[PDB]
Structures are given as C-alpha cells and as structure tokens.
Design a protein around this ligand. Structure first.
Ligand code: SF4
Ligand code: SF4
Ligand code: FES
Ligand SMILES: [K+]
Ligand SMILES: [Zn+2]
Lengths: 207, 129, 96, 691, 86, 48, 116
C-alpha cells in the first residue's frame, strides 16, 4: 500500500460499529449518539443522567468488561450551551479494546461522581473541578488539586487568560510572598496562523 | 423523561461572581463580537466563517531594559470563537461583559460575463487582455 | 564603521545611541556597551563586482547547500549592477 | 422562475442564468482556487487555476468564466480536477523565484497557500529559471517582477477601476512582461490598491517593506478619517506600533479599495506629535508641564469669561464625542460660538434639516442613477472612492456625467457644460439643452461639492443647485423615494458637527471676536491672531503640532483616530466608530476626556464619565449618531427649498475652481498627511519626477 | 436666561411621530420665518419616540415627549417652549 | 587544529576572550532600535 | 422548560440562604484561631470585617445554584484555612497589603493613564 498513508483496519471498524449498536440497543434511555472514527475509535455520547448506569454496564457486563478507567477529562467549548464536554476513556483487557464515553454540562449543572464505578476517578474529577469548575455530586473529597491554595478561577477554561490575573514575588517590607496583578515585561505575542484557504474538503460545513 | 427532580429558576444566567475574574476586567471592559474581515492581501475566505469575541485594546509600553512591548492587560490576547452571533452574545451576557455586535458582511453576488469584454457598443469592452 | 556620538558613546551598525539626556546610559557606567565592530554594510561594499557573460546569472551564496536559496539575477539594465537579494554580491554583464 | 438547477458534487443549487461555475460553487460554500479571477474585475481566464471537471464532459472548464448550464454536475474534488490543479501549480512555480524568506508576501501569499492546499509537495523542474528586470512605477509600489505570475489583475484594475491605461503586457510567450514599457510612474489616487490585488510579492508596499510578517500583526478594524467617505480599514499593529493600513470590505462604501492617502499617510502619526501639555513661560515660549498645571491655567481663564468672550473652532479630524463635550462645556458658560473651519451656508433652513447638507442618494445609490450633474467639485481628489463609484456606474450602467466647473480629469469622459456659475441659472430655467436631459432622466442625481460652498456666494450656489433639484424631483420622471439633491463633503468631522448644531465656518468668530479661543484640532489657519484681540487666550487641543499649536497659549495633547474609539459621520450621514489600535503617545489623552477633566477643574462638571455615557449624550442631541453603520434617510427638501428662496443672493462672476486641480494637490491636505514623509515623496515624484 | 436651541427628534415612518411629521410639513417653514436666528434642529431616526428638546442659557435642557401628539399639540408644545424660558 | 586548521575569515576574532561576567567588560543588554515617535519641537520664538 | 434545571444542593433561595448563614458562622468562629495559629498581625476585628466584606459583595445573587457554588467554594476555602494547608501568605492575600490604592475618581485616573 501507499508508503506514506496510514493503512485502514476494516475488521476493527466493523467490530466497533456492531458493539456500538449493541450498547445503544441496551441503554436507549441514555445513549444519544454513537460514532466510530476513521482510525477506529468508538465514542458513545450519552445524556449526563446516564453516567453511573452506562459506566456500570460497561464495567460489569460480560460482553464489555471495561475494568480500567484510562483517563477522565473535560473539554471547554464556549460556543455550546453546555460548554463542558466530559470524556471518559475506558479500557477492556478481556477484549483488548478501548471505548470513549462522552457527556456534557454547564457551569451550574452537577455531574454524578463516578468514584463508585472507578476509584481511579477520584483525582481525575478533582482535576476537572479545579481546572474547569465542573462540580461532581457526592464526591468523597472534592477540592483543588493542582492550583495554588486560594487561587481564583478555573484556568483551563477558554476565557481564562494564559498568564492569569495575578503573579507572585517576595516583598521585603512585609517579609513574605505576596500576590499582585500581572504585568509582563514582554507581552505574549499572539500569532494569526490560520490559512484563509480550506484544507480539508471532507469536513466542510453547510453555509 | 427524567428521574432527577428539577427546580425552576427564572433568574437571568449570571456567573460573574463564580468565575474568579477581578472586578476591573468585568465592568470596565468592552467586548466586540464580529465576523473577522477578509485579509485583503489574499482571496481565501476560510477565515471569515466564524464569529469572534475580542476585548478593547489597552496600553502597551516599552520595557526600559530591552524595549520590549509590556502590558498590564490580562485580556490582551483572549479571542473566543463562536458558531453564531447568538452564541457569542449569550456567552458575553452570562459573563457580565458589555458588548457591541457588528453584523456579518457577506459580499453581494456579482454579475460576471466574459462576453462583455468584447461589447459591440458598450463601455465594458476591454482595450487589452 | 564604529563612529562616536558627542557624548562619547559608540553608535551601533543599526544607528542606535542614547542621546544626551537619556538616563538609560547609566547602565553602561562601570561596564561597557557591547558593539560589534564588523559593519556588514561596509564589508559587503568592499567586494568586487563580478563580470559575467550572460543576461541572467544565478547565486547561491557559495558553498552549495551551505549558502542561501539559489536565485537568478537579471542583468539587462546597464545603468546598475545586479545585486543578490540574499548575500549582497553584485554582478555586471560584460559587453552587452 | 428563471433560476436553473445545477449540482455541485451532487448537491442541487438554484442559480440565475449567466452564473459562472465558480459562482455556483460559492453558493454551497466551496471556494474554487484562482489567481487571475477577481470578482470586481473583468474576467480574464488566463491563469487556469480554476479548472474543474464537469461530470460526463471530457474537458475541464475554466470555472471563473464558464457559464453553468442546466443539469451540470460540477466535481470540485475529482481526481481530474485535482490533477488539473497540480499541473497548473507546477507550471506557476517552475520559473518563480526562491524568494519567500526575503519576499514581503510570505505568510499571506495566495501562491504559497494554494501551493500547500492544491499543489504537489516537491519539484521536478530541473532547468534554470527566468529572471526579469524590475520596473519603477513610483515611490509607493515596489516591483519585483521576477515574482510576477502574469495574472493581469493589475492591468485590469488600472484600466477598469482607476481609469488609467498605463499598465500592459509587452513581449510574447515566456518573455511576456507586465509593465509600462517606457519609464513611467503609475501615480493615481487609487494606485496603492494594486498591491492588494496582486496575488504575489511582485507588487508590494514600498513604505511597508521588510517591517513585519503577517502572522505577527494584530488587526484593529477601524474607519478612515482622511476624507468624508468613511472608508472601512484594518489597522495592522505589532507590539504597540502601527505597521500598515489595509482596506476592509464594505460593499456600500469603499467596496474593497482605499485611496493612497488613506493607505500611506499613517506614517505621519509618528512625526510632529504632541506628547505633553505645554504652557507659555515667562519668556513667552511653550514649555512642558503637567496635566494638573495646564488644565488649571485653562480652567482659570474659562471661569472668568462668558458669552461671546468664549468661542471654539473644530478642525477636520475631530470626533463626535469631543465635539459634543466641547459644545456642552461652552454652553455652560452660555457660549454658542461653536464653529467649524469648513463653511456651509446658513441661509434658509441651514442645518435645521439634515437633507440640506447630506449626500441623500447615498454612495451605493450612484449605481442606480442614470444622469449625474457634478457642480464645483473634483470628486477624484475630494472623495476618490466616491469617484471610483461613479466610474463603475459609467462603465457598467452607461451613466451620463456632466460637470460645471474646471475641466478636471475624472478618469472617465464626461460632458463639460462650462465653469461659470450662471449655467446653473440656464439649467433651472430650461434654456440650457442639458436641462432636457435632466427632465428625461428617471433617476437624476445632482452633486454639489462642499468645496464650492467655501466661496463667499455659497448660499447663492446652493440655492441655484437646489432650485434645479426641486424643479426635477417634484415632477414626472422620478419616483417619490428617489432623492436628487446631494452634498459631497470632504472633511471627516463636518457632518457630525452639523448634526450637533455647530455653526459652519468662522464668520461668527469674526463678527464677535472672543477673548478665549479653543482650537480643537483646528489647523486650517482660518482664524489667526491677526483676527483676534491682542490678549486672546488660545487653547490648542490636538495630536500634531502644525498650524494651530504654534500660536497657542496652552497645548493639550489629544489622541489620533488610531488611538481612540470615536464616532465619525461620513458624507452620507452614516455614523461609524473607530477602535483603539494603539494608545496615545506620552501624556496624550482621549480628546473628550480632556474636556471632561477641564470641566471638573472649572467647576462645571459635565454629566458623563465613561465613553458609553458621552455616547448616550450624543443620542440626546442627534439620535442617528449612535446608529452605527446605518444610513438614516432625511426628508423635507420642499421645506428647505421654500426657505432657500426667501432671500435672493447674487452669484459671483468668478468661475468655479476646485481647490485640487492635479494629483500634486491630493497628497497633503491635513495635519497627518502634511507630516507624512511618504506623502512628501509622492509630491516630489509627481512634481520633479522619477529621477 | 433665554432659549438657545430647539431640537425635534422623530421617526420617518412610525405612527407615533405622525403629528410631528405633519407639523414639519405644514408649519415648520412658518416657524422658521418668525425665528430666523433660532436653531431648530430636526433630526429623524428610525424607531425613536418623538421628543422636543429645549436648550436654555448655561446649558440647561428640557425635553417634552411628543409621542402620539397631533400637529396642533406639537404647535402648543413649541409655543410654551418659545414663550416660557428656563 | 595543528593538523586541520580552521578556515580563515577577516571577521573572526584573532584574540579569544574568556567569560567576562562579573567584570567591567561584562555584557549589558540594551535596545538596538531607534526612537519610533518623534515629538513636536515648539518654536524657539514668542508668538508676538 | 429551559428554566427547569437540576439543583446543586438548594431547591430555592430560602434553602440556599440557610447554608450561607451556616458558612458565615463557621468563618466567624474560625477567625480567632486563624489569627493565633498563623500568628497574623491583624486583629480579630479586622479578620471578621474582611469576612463580612466577602459575604456582602455577593449579596445581590438570586440564583440558588449560583449561591450553592459560592457556599461550596467558601467551604473549601475554610477547610484550607482550618487544616493549615494554607500558609500565612495565602491568608494575608485577602488584604492586599503591598498594593497601592488605585485612584477611583475621574480626574485621578485621567492624570495617571488611559484606563477608565
Ligand atoms: S510571491 Fe509568494 S511564493 Fe513567491 S517568493 Fe513571495 S511569498 Fe514565496
Ligand atoms: S504584477 Fe501581480 S497583479 Fe500584475 S500581472 Fe503580475 S502577478 Fe498579476
Ligand atoms: S481564475 Fe479562472 S483562469 Fe484564472
Ligand atoms: K502583492
Ligand atoms: Zn547570493
């Protein structure tokens, strides 16, 4: 085949598609959309009420057995009404397969903690709360994990500035480290890099 | 539908108090919601598809040591992308930013005729090719 | 080359020099103003013009792939030399 | 029902007859690659980059020129189309020079970008390349013609848009060259636009050369103040400095063009700038001081004078926010002598009715007119983008143009009726034969230049022109909604001042000389110290030290149009606002904030502390001033004509002579352009020569 | 202490400005004759409630809403402004 | 270099220098560009 | 409808207000220990006035879910203080001791710069 072109795997594509329909048939109450990517990754998009039921089924069902929570993160998309996309990446050692489960939320809508299903989720959900400000209901110990104590804001939101709002220095008069509004000797230089010509016709959107 | 018992909230959605933004950069800022103009140096139109939100420009000054451009504006580089004008307005309102909206400027359809270059009795006849 | 201002400060090849009342020259007291003394504008001017026997000549700066992108220089005008946009070498058509 | 059905990759689209294949693809959001095609130029069809496969047709067609036929399926992504693009891109790059690192187009080059998206990734061209001599066409446009791809856009622009036929092709085949053949400078008020349309680095801005790369610039969308057209622009800045001015498309104003003064005079913003407040010392010399001290001196004088003892003149670049602030301040000492340098007759309605001083037909309405009468104006230099609109209609709508005044070169042929103003009497009465053409016309348009109203008999001329307009409009021929009478302004601040109730001209100040004079950017020199009492206290507020500043007692450094968010109303009455691109230099301040600060020191605090509040104030004086990008129609031409006929004034004998007769008078007309070193080179080029 | 300026704001099409429009078409010319040196700024803008602004000495301003006024009510509103100072 | 000497150039230092930090020969940074905005200079004579 | 939303903890403002008052009491009683434990140079009165100032600035909220998140964040802040996860620098960051007072009147801002 073409030496520079990634080869397609049509068997895995068909297997993942069939299992995606399988999941959607069993949990119609929650599954909103199922898709398989051209590089063979299965995504299950669900209503946020289905977090615990869907994850529990995927972990415990005999034909699923997704015992490992590889990763749990969020994505901020300000143009959406529910700006926060919550992404669960699961691994099945029994069937040597991965699956992605996605749901959504806004700044004020809690999501149910998945710690009951995966104890791995404990710190991942603290990170989502810290970095995105998404609240997780019934989390055993929800608090910041990566930011400074007393830090204000959620810095992975698309509208949080790259350099933040405050900066630190040691002040000799008060004999301690103090926080002050950020000033930069050199402002970060924004580059406009996007070409004005379309690159990928296959992804064109209706006018 | 749901087994989760919902509540009714008629309040206008406002999240200023829970975003951590300093008071200065909510009330004294002006957000501009617009579709970027085409860069006239090129004919490609692919950078005129989405709505953008930017903020009012503030002072930049020269660093005494090197002459670099310094700033005290934390929002000087923040540019948000939106699918529609309504999405951009909704985002600005709930964040408490004052804003202006500029309507999209679509080029108007033109009447193009190659044959017009060779008119028998009209001024569109070209003197050269 | 390196000239000096009335205050005694050296002028860089970019023309920079603090004027009389600029406090910023205090940074040089007890230290020095780093200035590069090989002005490229003077050095390239010392080079002689190459006489060639064609209307178009190409320059890659010498050394092959260690030079600059290869460009072709038109030599039709006889009122000036053809200069390389990359390295500044000059060419002139002999006879024609 | 005339629309036909065609398909773009199988998706149905309904298009009107005559639509090209390229335009059909636009409707479904697909942009065909192009080089020679430009939607505002005549079709050329020579680059062949737009070639596309029609389903079942063995030969590819030039999408930019081929009319689409019913039932055609356009395959914009088939192997046949993609191979055509790769082949054409290969030919374009064979002789192109390896110049991207040293070429200013790099980073915003259609050849670079379309090579990436539609070309191959490597070369199989193993020969030597063509090299071409450079052509000198003036001090604004640099030429590196080895980069030219012979798209002929510049030739078609110069011929069709600019009305100049100096650019052509010489030679044949691979040695075909774009240029002027002889040594000639392409000096036109629209010349700089050939930089934008040229898809490659062959034509570039000489003032801009080597200073920046496109990705590193920040774009501030703003408005031009070099004339009263109100051209939309993008101000490119980098690390707090203005780098260049580019056009910003506005179909109803400047389309995608700007004048050379708009494009290149920005370098005047870096010279002769007022950066600190200044007062006169004991030796009578201006010396720097603090804002506290300068305002206290001004506030002390303002508190001791009232009524006609206080007056203000507003120059041509003042914004509406500053104008209203100064008017409110002077009103609080019960002074109404708020004047502008640009005269507009106050006889009859005067400024009571907006229709009396606006371009009522609007700029875009020129394309619907079938006759235009130009009176006492050189629109080519007073409003270059408005003159380009007239040429566009002359070209495509076969518009008939007549001129009363000096016979200037408008770039299109017109009918010269003479220069005496008495011809206006003949046309009104019906004696003149051109009177019949106006009566025939379905949509006549009569344009009177603001420059012609600077004559001492301006009221007579305006009455004469209004008489012609009203005899036509209220009669068979023109619909009720078509507006005939138009004023063409040349000063960016004039219409806003008139909307706000300023007195046009300085006659009021001459009648009752004041003891305290505010010069708000007033650099025309209409009022000098020889026209004022010996002890007149003059306060100059502005951004350039030029004419007003040398004679002032206090200088208050204001901001330029690139350094503030300010409202300007163009010649049509359309309100538009600039945006801050860079903050003002040194200690300079936003102009309305200076007046607001002054009022607080003087104990007459104005009731607005923010920009939004002073704009709410603008709405209370003239509501249209905050309706941005909207043209508000003005009526009551009959009422204006009734008041105009009440006092009969006699025209003067001297013929109408525009202040600008040749291009040399175009470049320097205000403080910014007079400080521009680029504009100075332009004057030298057109006067002395290329040498 | 007297009147300094008059401004009349109105819409070009709204029925709430119909009376103000009638006043201009019928009576403005006569009003301007009697008051040759008084600024009477007529400013039309779409979708505004009609108003009469009167500016007196030293920057004091009064506004009177003219919404749904007849041409005769507008006349009397202007008469009060012209007669009574403030 | 006694066997393969470096290529000679007119601009190469003939006198190598060691680390000058902490001495009067130390490098001191500064902006190499010229002033960007020229300020207006008032006339040196009284108005009248 | 779109106004039918999922609550966090409180189903209405009266339930939310109870949580606010409980948080305020916890902070009010913590200040004396914080001043002693972190050996601060502020008085207990200064600390408690700072607590009151922080609660007042959010007095205008009428959305129970927003109030819920304010209380959730306020309780996290309290836990950081009580457990001594914060250091003295973090506690003193509420008082901005090294920041000079920025001017607030129009004239004072006019003299110093361009910002409103
Ligand atoms: S015109 Fe474009 S492709 Fe040609 S040298 Fe310049 S940047 Fe490169
Ligand atoms: S100079 Fe530019 S616009 Fe003119 S023909 Fe060449 S590539 Fe086209
Ligand atoms: S764009 Fe059609 S041939 Fe050039
Ligand atoms: K170009
Ligand atoms: Zn070279």
């Amino acid at each position: 085949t073409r030496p520079t072109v990634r080869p397609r795997n049509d068997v895995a594509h068909k297997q993942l598609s069939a299992f995606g329909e399988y999941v959607a048939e069993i949990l119609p109450k929650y599954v909103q959309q199922v898709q398989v990517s051209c590089f063979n990754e299965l995504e299950i998009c669900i209503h946020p009420d289905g977090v615990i039921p869907v994850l529990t089924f995927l972990r415990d069902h005999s034909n699923a057995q997704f015992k490992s929570l590889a990763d749990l993160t969020a994505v901020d998309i300000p143009t959406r009404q529910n700006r926060f996309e919550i992404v669960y990446n699961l691994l099945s050692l029994r069937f040597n397969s991965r699956i992605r489960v996605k749901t959504y939320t806004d700044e004020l809508t809690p999501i149910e903690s998945s710690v009951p299903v995966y104890k791995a989720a404990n710190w991942y959900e603290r990170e989502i709360w810290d970095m995105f400000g998404v609240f997780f209901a019934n989390h055993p110990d929800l608090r910041r994990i990566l930011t400074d104590y007393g830090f204000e804001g959620h810095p992975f939101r698309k509208d949080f500035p790259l350099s933040g709002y405050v900066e630190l220095r040691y002040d000799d008069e008060v004999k301690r480290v103090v926080a002050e509004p950020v000033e930069l000797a050199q402002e970060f230089r924004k580059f406009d890099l996007n070409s004005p010509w379309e690159a990928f016709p296959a992804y064109r959107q209706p006018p | 539908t749901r087994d989760t018992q919902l509540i009714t909230v008629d309040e206008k959605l406002d999240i200023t108090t829970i975003t951590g933004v300093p008071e200065e950069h909510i009330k004294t800022r002006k957000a501009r919601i617009f579709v970027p103009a085409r860069n006239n140096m090129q004919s490609g139109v692919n950078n005129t598809k989405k709505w953008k939100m930017e903020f009012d420009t503030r002072e930049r000054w020269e660093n005494p040591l090197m002459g670099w451009a310094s700033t005290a504006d934390p929002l000087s580089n923040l540019v948000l992308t939106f699918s529609t004008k309504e999405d951009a307005v909704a985002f600005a309102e709930k964040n408490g930013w004052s804003y202006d909206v500029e309507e999209r400027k679509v080029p108007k359809p033109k009447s193009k005729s190659y044959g017009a270059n060779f008119s028998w009795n009209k001024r569109t006849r070209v003197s050269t090719k | 080359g390196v000239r000096t201002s009335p205050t005694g400060e050296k002028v860089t090849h970019t023309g920079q020099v603090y004027d009389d009342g600029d406090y910023r020259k205090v940074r040089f007291v007890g230290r020095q103003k780093e200035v590069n003394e090989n002005f490229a504008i003077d050095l390239i001017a010392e080079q002689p013009v190459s006489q060639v026997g064609s209307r178009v000549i190409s320059c890659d700066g010498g050394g092959g792939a260690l030079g600059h992108p290869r460009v072709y220089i038109n030599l039709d005008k006889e009122t000036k030399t053809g200069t390389c946009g990359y390295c500044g070498l000059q060419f002139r058509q002999q006879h024609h | 029902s005339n629309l036909i059905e065609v398909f773009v990759d199988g998706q149905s689209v309904m298009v009107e007859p005559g639509t090209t294949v390229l335009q059909a693809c636009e409707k479904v959001g697909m942009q065909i690659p192009r080089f020679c095609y430009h939607e505002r130029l005549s079709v050329a069809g020579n680059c062949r980059m737009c070639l596309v496969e029609i389903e079942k047709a063995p030969k590819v067609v030039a999408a930019c020129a081929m009319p689409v036929m019913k039932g055609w399926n356009i395959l914009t992504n088939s192997e046949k189309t993609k191979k055509a693009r790769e082949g054409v891109m290969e030919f374009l790059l064979a002789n192109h020079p390896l110049d991207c690192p040293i070429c200013d187009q790099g980073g915003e080059c259609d050849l670079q970008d379309q090579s990436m998206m539609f070309g191959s990734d490597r070369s199989r061209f193993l020969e030597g390349k063509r090299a071409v001599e450079d052509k000198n066409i003036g001090p604004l446009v640099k030429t590196i013609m080895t980069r030219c791809i012979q798209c002929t856009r510049c030739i078609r622009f110069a011929s069709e848009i600019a009305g100049v036929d100096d650019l052509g092709t010489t030679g044949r085949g691979n040695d075909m060259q774009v240029g002027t053949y002889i040594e000639k400078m392409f000096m036109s008020e629209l010349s700089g636009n050939i930089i934008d349309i040229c898809p490659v680095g062959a034509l570039t801005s000489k003032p801009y050369a080597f200073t920046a790369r496109p990705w590193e610039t920040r774009k501030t969308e703003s408005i031009d103040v070099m004339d009263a057209v109100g051209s939309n622009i993008v101000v490119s800045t980098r690390t707090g400095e203005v780098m260049r001015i580019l056009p910003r498309m506005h179909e109803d104003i400047n389309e995608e063009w700007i004048s050379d003064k708009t494009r290149f005079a920005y370098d005047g913003l870096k010279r002769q700038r007022l950066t600190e407040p200044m007062v006169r010392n004991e030796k009578g010399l201006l010396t720097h001081t603090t804002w506290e001290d300068a305002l206290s001196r001004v506030a002390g004088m303002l508190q001791s004078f009232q009524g006609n003892d206080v007056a203000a003149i507003a120059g041509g670049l003042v914004d509406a926010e500053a104008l209203i602030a100064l008017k409110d301040l002077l009103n609080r000492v019960d002074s109404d002598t708020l004047c502008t340098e640009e005269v507009f007759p106050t006889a009859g309605a005067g400024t009571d009715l907006r229709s009396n001083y606006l371009l009522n037909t609007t700029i875009a309405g020129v394309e619907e007119a079938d006759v235009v009468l130009l009176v006492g104006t050189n629109p080519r230099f007073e409003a270059p983008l408005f003159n380009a609109r007239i040429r566009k209609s002359w070209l495509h709508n076969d518009l008939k143009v007549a001129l009363i005044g000096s016979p200037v070169d408008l770039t299109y042929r017109y009918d010269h009726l003479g220069d005496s103003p008495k011809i206006l009497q003949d046309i009104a009465s019906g004696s003149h034969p051109f009177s019949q053409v106006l009566q025939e016309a379905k949509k006549p348009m009569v344009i009177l230049g603001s420059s012609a109203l600077q004559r001492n008999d301006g009221a007579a001329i305006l009455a004469a022109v209004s008489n012609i307009a009203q005899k036509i409009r209220t009669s068979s021929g023109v619909t009720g909604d078509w507006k005939v009478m138009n004023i063409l302004h040349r000063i960016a601040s004039q219409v806003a001042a008139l909307d706000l109730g300023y007195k046009p001209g300085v006659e009021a100040i001459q009648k009752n000389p004041p003891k305290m004079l505010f010069l708000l950017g007033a650099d025309g020199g209409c009022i000098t110290r020889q026209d004022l009492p010996k002890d007149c206290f003059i306060v100059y507020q502005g951004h350039h030290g030029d004419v007003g500043a040398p004679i002032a007692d206090v200088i208050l450094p204001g901001a330029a149009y690139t350094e503030k968010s300010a409202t300007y109303v163009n010649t049509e009455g359309r309100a538009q606002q600039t945006k801050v691109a860079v903050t003002p230099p040194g200690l300079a301040r936003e102009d309305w904030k200076i007046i607001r600060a002054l009022s607080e020191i003087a104990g007459m605090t104005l009731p607005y502390d923010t920009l939004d509040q002073v704009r709410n104030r603008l709405e209370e004086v003239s509501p249209n001033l905050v309706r941005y990008d909207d043209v508000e129609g003005a009526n009551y031409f009959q009422q204006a004509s009734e008041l105009s006929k009440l006092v009969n004034q006699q025209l003067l004998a001297d013929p109408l002579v525009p202040p600008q007769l040749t291009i040399k008078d175009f470049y320097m007309t205000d403080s910014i352009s007079r400080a521009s070193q680029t504009m100075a080179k332009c004057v030298k080029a057109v006067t002395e020569g290329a040498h | 202490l007297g009147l300094r300026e008059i401004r009349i704001h109105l819409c070009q099409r709204s029925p709430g400005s119909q009376g103000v429009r009638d006043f201009i078409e019928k009576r403005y010319v006569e009003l301007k004759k009697a008051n040759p040196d008084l600024p009477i700024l007529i400013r039309e803008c779409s979708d505004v409630q009609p108003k009469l602004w009167a500016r007196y000495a030293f920057g004091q301003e009064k506004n009177v809403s003219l919404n749904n006024f007849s041409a005769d009510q507008v006349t009397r509103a202007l008469e009060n402004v012209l007669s009574s100072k403030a | 270099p006694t066997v393969k000497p470096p290529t000679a150039r007119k601009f190469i230092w003939t006198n190598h220098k060691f680390n000058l930090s902490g001495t009067p020969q130390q490098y001191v940074p500064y902006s190499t560009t010229r002033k960007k905005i020229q300020e207006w200079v008032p006339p040196s004579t009284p108005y009248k | 409808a779109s106004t039918s939303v999922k609550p966090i903890f409180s189903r209405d403002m009266n339930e939310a207000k109870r949580r606010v008052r409980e948080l305020y009491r916890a902070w009010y009683r913590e200040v004396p220990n914080t001043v002693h434990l972190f050996q601060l140079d502020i008085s207990v009165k200064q600390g408690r006035d700072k607590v009151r100032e922080m609660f007042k600035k959010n007095a205008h909220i009428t959305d129970p879910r927003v109030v819920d998140l304010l209380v959730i964040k306020g309780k996290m802040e309290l836990e950081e203080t009580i457990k001594v996860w914060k250091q003295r620098t973090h506690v003193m960051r509420f008082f901005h001791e090294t920041e000079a007072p920025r001017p607030k009147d129009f004239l004072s801002k006019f003299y110093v710069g361009h910002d409103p």
